[PDB]
Symmetry: C3
Subunit: 161 residues, 3 copies
């Protein structure tokens, strides 16, 4: 079994629904950690203090689903925070949490460079954030048009030149 899963994909790719289905199959006590501004599911708000909330609510009998990382970074960005320390803190939290967690996050770097400095800083922070999370998490799935593809665990390619 795994401690941590990162689910990454485009906007409106069905990643939430995928994270939901993996969580329900765990037959553990299910918490939605909601970041945006049935009865087996407890909803907990975490608009800004995501790491603090995760450390508060995590326990071995619970599975927390963060829905979602991108709207948490949007909250921090608009509040004026430096996104780097909280991203780095979140990666430490994901590596050593006292209960299982699924993180839902968006790919935002696969379009044209934004014509707006905040959009660029956001694109960079979200890209760094997914790299840190993927490295810290036991498993990573890409979700494309509702279909999940595992990309960790799995060996990295090695090429000879």
């Amino acid at each position: 079994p795994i401690k941590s899963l990162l689910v990454v994909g485009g906007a409106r790719s069905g990643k939430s629904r995928f994270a939901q289905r993996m969580a329900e199959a765990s037959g553990r006590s299910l918490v939605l950690i909601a970041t945006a501004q049935d009865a087996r599911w407890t909803l907990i708000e975490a608009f800004f203090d995501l790491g603090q909330t995760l450390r508060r609510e995590a326990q071995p009998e619970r599975l927390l689903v963060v829905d979602c990382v991108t709207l948490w970074l949007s909250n921090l960005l608009l509040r004026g925070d430096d996104l780097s320390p909280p991203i780095k803190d979140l990666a430490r939290t994901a590596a050593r949490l006292e209960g299982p967690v699924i993180f839902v996050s968006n790919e935002v770097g696969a379009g044209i460079v934004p014509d707006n400095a905040l959009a660029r800083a956001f694109r960079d922070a979200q890209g760094m954030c997914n790299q840190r999370l993927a490295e810290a998490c036991d498993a990573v799935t890409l979700v494309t048009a509702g279909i999940a593809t595992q990309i960790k665990p799995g060996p990295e390619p090695v090429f000879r030149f």
Copy 2:
């Protein structure tokens, strides 16, 4: 054999070329359903009435390639139409075709969307449409820099927490 293929990926990723290649190996009579407003291939235009055209023109003697779902959704959005009805109709049709169809569609959710309500609406609509076409079609392929990866059929990843 399969009845339905979705070819998804970024813009100018070689999706059309891949759909055309799968079509030409089929030995059926080949029809291009062209949604864009300005050999062994018949062209039939369907700027708006795509689900209608598919119910009427699909048949066991033919293979239709829809080129492409993104411009059809765009055509509707800019005409003023509500997008949820045509999308749910397309997905219903896609599950019940008279003969083989390949859907070409764009990923539009892996960037930073323009800050305008029309762009957000388009992104949400295109994303739910690809999820519904992926669910309805027998097979799905992601095309990356001209190279196709099959993601359906295939066993969905499972995890123990």
Copy 3:
């Protein structure tokens, strides 16, 4: 025993493609540094082991001259090169075709770092649309010419070539 090409079935060419801040640049380094060759950065933007050569526009010319059996060139990166040509008003089709023909016919190994820019909504201007079309087209031709293609997502590399592409029978 059976034929395996000399040097442990090596590659001469690798395309690394991913979004902005996907970790593609640092995967390209890990690969370059396991090669044992003299490592050259071909910088397109206008360390002890790394030589740097700048090629803001003449990327084709520069690869042809500088590639050698004992060198590994890393092109960082295809997207700024293309951006450099677009802003100068150059026809993009000929240099793209010239670059993939160069990649197929190289005297020394080369890694190409390139961006995916085609998976969002393009701003409503003809220059953004032109760049999206050229970069998509350019990644298609490089992918076809290169021995190996890696997609890097959230700093995790997936090999998509070499490998059999799927076929669908109707």
